[PDB]
Design a protein around this motif. Structure first.
Motif, PDB file in Angstrom:
ATOM      1  N   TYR A 172      33.623  25.970  35.561  1.00  0.00           N
ATOM      2  CA  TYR A 172      33.378  26.813  36.732  1.00  0.00           C
ATOM      3  C   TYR A 172      33.023  25.964  37.946  1.00  0.00           C
ATOM      4  CZ  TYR A 172      31.810  30.860  39.422  1.00  0.00           C
ATOM      5  OH  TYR A 172      31.658  31.833  40.385  1.00  0.00           O
ATOM      6  N   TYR A 198      30.936  37.696  27.863  1.00  0.00           N
ATOM      7  CA  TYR A 198      30.262  36.450  28.197  1.00  0.00           C
ATOM      8  C   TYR A 198      29.071  36.215  27.274  1.00  0.00           C
ATOM      9  CZ  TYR A 198      28.786  32.560  31.147  1.00  0.00           C
ATOM     10  OH  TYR A 198      28.514  31.291  31.639  1.00  0.00           O
ATOM     11  N   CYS A 230      28.516  25.124  34.558  1.00  0.00           N
ATOM     12  CA  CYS A 230      28.767  26.155  33.570  1.00  0.00           C
ATOM     13  C   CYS A 230      30.251  26.290  33.277  1.00  0.00           C
ATOM     14  CB  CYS A 230      28.272  27.512  34.053  1.00  0.00           C
ATOM     15  SG  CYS A 230      26.457  27.561  34.269  1.00  0.00           S
ATOM     16  N   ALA A 280      33.380  28.766  32.172  1.00  0.00           N
ATOM     17  CA  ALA A 280      33.801  30.131  32.437  1.00  0.00           C
ATOM     18  C   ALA A 280      35.006  30.404  31.554  1.00  0.00           C
ATOM     19  CB  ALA A 280      34.178  30.286  33.890  1.00  0.00           C
ATOM     20  N   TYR A 312      38.242  27.154  40.050  1.00  0.00           N
ATOM     21  CA  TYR A 312      38.080  27.055  38.569  1.00  0.00           C
ATOM     22  C   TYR A 312      39.319  27.392  37.744  1.00  0.00           C
ATOM     23  CZ  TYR A 312      37.309  32.153  39.053  1.00  0.00           C
ATOM     24  OH  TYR A 312      37.420  33.500  39.390  1.00  0.00           O
TER      25      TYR A 312
END
Ligand SMILES: *[C@@H]1O[C@H](CO)[C@@H](O[C@@H]2O[C@H](CO)[C@@H](O[C@@H]3O[C@H](CO)[C@@H](O)[C@H](O)[C@@H]3O)[C@H](O)[C@H]2NC(C)=O)[C@H](O)[C@H]1NC(C)=O
Ligand SMILES: *[C@@H]1O[C@H](CO)[C@@H](O[C@@H]2O[C@H](CO)[C@@H](O)[C@H](O)[C@H]2NC(C)=O)[C@H](O)[C@H]1NC(C)=O
Ligand SMILES: *[C@@H]1O[C@H](CO)[C@@H](O[C@@H]2O[C@H](CO)[C@@H](O)[C@H](O)[C@H]2NC(C)=O)[C@H](O)[C@H]1NC(C)=O
Ligand SMILES: *[C@@H]1O[C@H](CO)[C@@H](O[C@@H]2O[C@H](CO)[C@@H](O)[C@H](O)[C@H]2NC(C)=O)[C@H](O)[C@H]1NC(C)=O
Ligand SMILES: *[C@@H]1O[C@H](CO)[C@@H](O[C@@H]2O[C@H](CO)[C@@H](O)[C@H](O)[C@H]2NC(C)=O)[C@H](O)[C@H]1NC(C)=O
Ligand SMILES: *[C@@H]1O[C@H](CO)[C@@H](O[C@@H]2O[C@H](CO)[C@@H](O)[C@H](O)[C@H]2NC(C)=O)[C@H](O)[C@H]1NC(C)=O
Ligand SMILES: [Ca+2]
Ligand SMILES: [Ca+2]
Ligand SMILES: [Ca+2]
Ligand SMILES: [Ca+2]
Ligand SMILES: [Cu+2]
Ligand SMILES: [Cu+2]
Lengths: 710, 715
Positions: free
Chosen positions: A179, A125, A154, A156, A183
């Protein structure tokens, strides 16, 4: 309980193994949570089963309890040449030793083969956050989300596996998603390939970028082409489509709760530790953190039927238009299939009347972790009688009605690695039939819609393709029918054409019973191309009172077929999926058909099932093991949104007695009711247990949702 | 709910009205079914005759008038020089005025021989045996302790097999002789008798052949003589009249872990969640009508989900058991249940056993081989029951010791159930409706097996189950008619397969990607969609509408078959002509009013030249693009009996059927309208929020005490 030989490690035992290893300073152990790959860490600890030879002497011949041991998997990342090594740690209680297991001389890809970990995801990440900085404006313009100062908006990612094109690579395609609730079903159209092989995450790189049907080389190149107007861009209160929240209206709305099970008189099975008694049945169970649910030492009427019935692997093999899609061959044991047994919701996942059982797992954790309601055990009415008969007099009345209400005992767990939830059942009927079942639910694996996608799946929403795939599950079925030494035979119907014995000018063309014996392993390795006989029998030389060999029959419920070409590349990891049924001679070196390493090195894995057949051994009067592949092709469809549902989406098999018992073994049941006519009065309702109409309340619903050390 | 009445079975009153109208026609010379002569005219069957689909759909969908209601009446004309069976349509109902020809078969000369057996005929057969076997009376007492003559509690009985001869027009039945004790099906004596009962004068009936314990004897007198002369290897049976008889359901033995209390039970304190009114059912998304056709069994009609039609008709068509044997009766046996009134042997369902105590139980009336319409208590039941597995569930982990949410929907299903108990076997017939638009057909088999006398030679055709007992090998085959009307009448049929491609790896050109692709096959002609057992059956069998869902995919329903059936008899050989549908796990035909059924009451007793040959529906190889299609499904299983089948076959693992599942029909999961869904959400520093749309239930209720009647009589 003798069943304790089969039991998983307790919290105390896991702590003792962990403490023992941490006492060895030379191991340089660090916690799973530390965010470097250049560390030594204990990845998995679970009970390591003793040899069957010793177990049976303990169970059957009154000899000593075998030594209890743990399997400990250690990631040695803090050395010049990282590897994974496994050890037997024992004895329990009071561990002394640490013995290395299963060497592979000449195999160089141990490190690359290892599972992904939470710490590794954290580093990925970070890599993505940094590497995609040039795309920040692109992200905002195309999705309204980003990786930077994003809060409730955000991006993901979902990684696919395997991770490269050859043994030793660790290059993962990552599907970028928004996200939001559910998701999994929100791909953005971007996919990124990251090389994360180095133990120094500062070396990790995005090596390739795919966006809406084109490759772009790097985030910088995509950003530049976007700025220059050279990118075909897709710019992306009722519930979200990916939510389970109700919407729509039935034509006949339902506003009340449906019928529920009550158990005012308590369980009719006895549970003591990991030992279960139910009517004719006795068995032990375990939940192997690596591979999942098992039932062991299964007896009916005090006679052994199966030493082990266990989940071995569960696979989903995809095609796709996008690079991530065409890459995806997921093997669940590589993700801790038995360690993702998350909390069962009372009244929904199991009946409100069920017995819920906790367990502990040590899999990619700093300490042993408590999993509440990881399994449940319950008796349920099936809604169909085990047997019934109306004995008519054909003159407006009857001689009797006889019936036995249908009940079954269910032992259940789940696996939710990520998107999918599998429900794993072992089911025991009062007449000596047992069944294994797996039901699929949860979210599908999905990729971004483009038209080219329709060759590999179904459009399920505006921006969403449900990729075509096949689910395949392998089970180990170590039947020991009335004991260890068995044979395997099949029965078929074959017609004969004879002179009609009472009218010789005519013919009788009729069924006959044909029996086929099997001498060598290869003869009993049935490919999907081969005609599977209707009666698959595991036999004891013992005969029943009528002169027929005592047997158990295997009946498979599956829509599986050959998926990958035999011998081609990643197929080496799933050679078991060539055979709906294969039969092997029992060997300690062949206890498992897969491993936690198969996912990330499917090209050169530590177990190749096909090799179990290479020696083509004699299987007449031997300890035999049946291995069963079940599965189904899943072409997704719009009704899979938000989740796949369980009706019609289950596979498994039955084990049915066949000349094993002298008559129906459910005749011992005192639930049977017979209604008899009487001259000039009411009928006599004959019972062996009183009629019951009591009702009681279950516990109020609760749900925790956390799984933490204790 | 009033409209479902077009599909409804006849009432007691309607049956009486039809019977009276026929009895008013003195020229028919009608006598009661119970009269013990075959040389009589009698009404054998009366049942509702469904109107033409064209007219029904105009009524249902276009606001046109209710079609005329009619009854089928089957008349046995035995009181004439050339006996025959003729059918009529009697109407209108109410107020019957006419009887018009129905299903005429001009030029066919064996209708009398083809007719089902009746109670009167069995009585005459018993009288024939009592007289013909007089020479064997002492043989019977010595070898069995039982007799045909002068018996009270130690009576011999017989079980007839069918078909009855070796060619069309014959009525020569093999009879298995048995001791009439509890579970008599399993007590063969070793004697079998062939009786020619073709004549309408029972005085002409004769035992034409005798089989005993491995040898043929010609007549009862010859066997009696050889026995008397000490030339017969006899088997002397023990006395069957403290432990239960092996053929009894009474408990014996003891489990190692004692069970002294009742197991868990369903409660339904809020009452049914389905709406049953007359023969109309509403259940969440579902609407359907049902009927129990006396001749052929259970049907569901005009099946809709979400206000759109899915199926016009799903019905039981035939149920067969095809045997081999060492004995002449065994090797003769090919039983076709519709020849015995498959839909008329719907005997009483025991509450708490046959259906949950919480079920709705329904009575019916039948007129099949009776003097008056007969009331059948608790012939059907309809119930909702928890399946024990959630329809859907998901644990949305945060992968850090907690969760984002848990969501789940408790599993329930609606079951419409009846049974058929012609004689030995009890079949349980379910149509099941899931809240997500999946429906399932299921048949479970229980009751007693068809069995013959043990000799060693029997082991090539079955399994020794007791001292003197062989369970004969056979195959069960069931035929269903599945008239899908997916979103309406005009449909097509297509299949999907996975096919691998082998391409250059687009991101690593030195390498290959060998991967799944989705292949679609279209079918234009009936023959293309007739799948034989030897043919590979595609994993996706789709019935499609031209209408697209919001994502551009055609709205479809998928058929998924659960079966272990295979080809049993050789195609084209003799009695196989009666069961040509059993060549096909799936076949698809163009809808036609002359092809509504794949079998008949006549098939059992003339399998050589029956009135419907399913293969004939495929002869014209019709175009099936955008047409009213009918799917026809064969399900079944080989049954090699085993000792666990004593006293009865059990249901676990002994069911077959199929599912119909929506496939791109709805925009998303159609169960999303269910308010039973629960979602649990985390809260920072607090207990979770349990989100519901129906309050939590823990209420209690009690069912009525068990009762059971066991009689079925006119009212
Ligand atoms: C099966 O049997 C039925 C009943 O016997 C037959 O129907 C009957 O056919 C006869 C003709 O043989 C009709 O009889 C009368 O004939 C005189 C001529 O002498 C005629 O003038 C009268 O109007 C009358 O038709 C009789 O009405 C008719 N009965 C019924 C209820 O329809 C039938 O023909 C036989 N089927 C076959 C295929 O042989
Ligand atoms: C994998 O790494 C382990 C741990 O560094 C190696 O195991 C060590 O091997 C050395 C040399 O034989 C021994 O002196 C140590 O006792 C071992 N340590 C432990 C904890 O077992 C191992 O050699 C490597 N495995 C392979 C196949 O190379
Ligand atoms: C069963 O066997 C019989 C006897 O061999 C076959 O009948 C023969 O068929 C041929 C070709 O049709 C005729 O020419 C002969 O006259 C027949 N012989 C007899 C004695 O009937 C019959 O076809 C076979 N049936 C099956 C299904 O195999
Ligand atoms: C989930 O379970 C844990 C453990 O039972 C709960 O934590 C406890 O909460 C109780 C009630 O406030 C406290 O008295 C204890 O201090 C806690 N025990 C431990 C071991 O932490 C937790 O509250 C539950 N969470 C939810 C959302 O229900
Ligand atoms: C997929 O196709 C490729 C390309 O045709 C096949 O790879 C060739 O295989 C032969 C051996 O049979 C080699 O001599 C060639 O050098 C290979 N060519 C390339 C470009 O790799 C491959 O075998 C096919 N795989 C499958 C499963 O069909
Ligand atoms: C089966 O049902 C019938 C019909 O209900 C019962 O017959 C009735 O019996 C009651 C006695 O309880 C009488 O009051 C009625 O006169 C009877 N009615 C008819 C129409 O006959 C019968 O008793 C029941 N049989 C059994 C064995 O329970
Ligand atoms: Ca071997
Ligand atoms: Ca074994
Ligand atoms: Ca046709
Ligand atoms: Ca149709
Ligand atoms: Cu799937
Ligand atoms: Cu059977």
């Amino acid at each position: 309980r003798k069943a304790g030989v089969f039991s998983d490690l307790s919290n105390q035992e896991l702590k003792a193994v962990h403490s023992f290893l941490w006492s060895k300073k030379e191991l340089r152990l660090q916690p799973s949570s530390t965010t470097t790959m250049a560390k030594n860490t204990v990845f998995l600890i679970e009970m390591l089963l003793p040899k069957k030879y010793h177990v049976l002497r303990f169970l059957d011949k009154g000899e000593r309890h075998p030594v209890r041991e743990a399997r400990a998997v250690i990631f040695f990342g803090d050395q010049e040449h990282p590897n994974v090594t496994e050890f037997a740690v024992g004895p329990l209680p009071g561990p002394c030793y640490m013995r290395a297991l299963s060497p592979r001389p000449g195999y160089q890809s141990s490190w690359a083969s290892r599972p992904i970990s939470t710490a590794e995801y954290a580093l990925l990440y970070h890599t993505l956050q940094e590497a995609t900085k040039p795309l920040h404006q692109f992200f905002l313009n195309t999705t309204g989300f980003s990786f930077q100062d994003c809060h409730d908006r955000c991006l993901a990612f979902t990684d696919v596996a395997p991770r490269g094109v050859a043994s030793g690579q660790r290059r993962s395609w990552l599907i970028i998603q928004r996200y939001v609730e559910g998701y999994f079903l929100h791909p953005t159209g971007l996919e990124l390939l990251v090389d994360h092989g180095s133990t120094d995450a500062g070396h990790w790189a995005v090596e390739q970028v795919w966006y809406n049907g084109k490759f772009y080389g790097s985030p910088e190149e995509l950003a530049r082409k976007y700025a220059d107007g050279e990118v075909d861009v897709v710019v992306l209160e009722p519930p979200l489509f990916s939510s389970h929240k109700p919407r729509g209206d039935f034509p006949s709305p339902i506003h009340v709760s449906g019928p529920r099970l009550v158990q005012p008189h308590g369980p009719r099975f006895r549970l003591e530790g990991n030992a279960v008694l139910y009517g004719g049945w006795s068995f032990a169970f375990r939940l192997r953190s690596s591979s999942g649910l098992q039932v062991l030492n299964v007896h009916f009427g005090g006679e052994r039927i199966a030493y082990e019935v266990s989940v071995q692997e569960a696979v989903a093999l995809y095609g796709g238009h996008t690079p991530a899609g065409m890459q995806t061959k997921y093997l669940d044991v590589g993700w801790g299939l038995g360690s993702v047994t998350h909390e069962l919701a009372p009244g929904i996942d199991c009946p409100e009347t069920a017995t819920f059982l906790d367990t502990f797992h040590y899999y990619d954790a700093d300490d042993p972790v408590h999993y509440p309601r990881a399994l449940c055990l319950f008796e349920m009415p099936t809604g169909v009688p085990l047997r019934r008969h109306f004995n008519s007099n054909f003159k407006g009345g009857f001689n009797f009605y006889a019936g036995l209400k249908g009940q079954v005992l269910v032992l259940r767990t789940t696996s939710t690695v990520y998107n999918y939830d599998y429900i794993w059942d072992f089911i025991f009927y009062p007449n000596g039939v047992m069944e294994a079942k797996m039901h699929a639910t949860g979210y599908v694996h999905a990729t971004f819609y483009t038209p080219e996608g329709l060759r590999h799946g179904t459009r399920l929403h505006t921006h969403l393709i449900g990729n075509i795939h096949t689910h395949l599950v392998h089970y180990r079925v170590d039947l020991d029918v009335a004991g260890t030494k068995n044979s395997f035979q099949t029965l078929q119907m074959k017609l004969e054409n004879i002179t009609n014995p009472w009218s010789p000018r005519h013919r009788v063309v009729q069924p006959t019973l044909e029996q086929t014996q099997y001498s060598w392993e290869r003869q009993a390795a049935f490919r999907f191309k081969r005609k599977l006989p209707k009666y698959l029998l595991f036999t004891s030389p013992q005969e029943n009172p009528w002169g027929h060999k005592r047997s158990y029959r295997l009946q498979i419920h599956s829509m599986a077929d050959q998926v990958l070409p035999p011998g081609w590349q990643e197929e080496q990891a799933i050679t078991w999926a060539r055979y709906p049924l294969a039969v092997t001679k029992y060997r300690e070196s062949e206890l498992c058909s897969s491993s936690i390493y198969h996912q990330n090195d499917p090209w050169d894995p530590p177990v190749v099932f096909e090799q179990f057949l290479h020696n083509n051994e004699n299987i007449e009067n031997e300890d035999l093991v049946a291995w069963v592949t079940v599965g189904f092709l899943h072409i997704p469809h719009s009704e899979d949104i938000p989740n796949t549902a369980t009706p019609g989406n289950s596979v498994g098999f039955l084990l049915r007695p066949f000349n094993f018992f002298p008559e129906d073994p459910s005749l011992a049941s005192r639930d049977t009711v017979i209604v008899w006519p009487r001259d000039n009065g009411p009928n006599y309702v004959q019972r062996w247990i009183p009629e019951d109409r009591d009702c009681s309340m279950p516990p109020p619903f609760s749900y925790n949702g956390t799984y933490r050390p204790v």
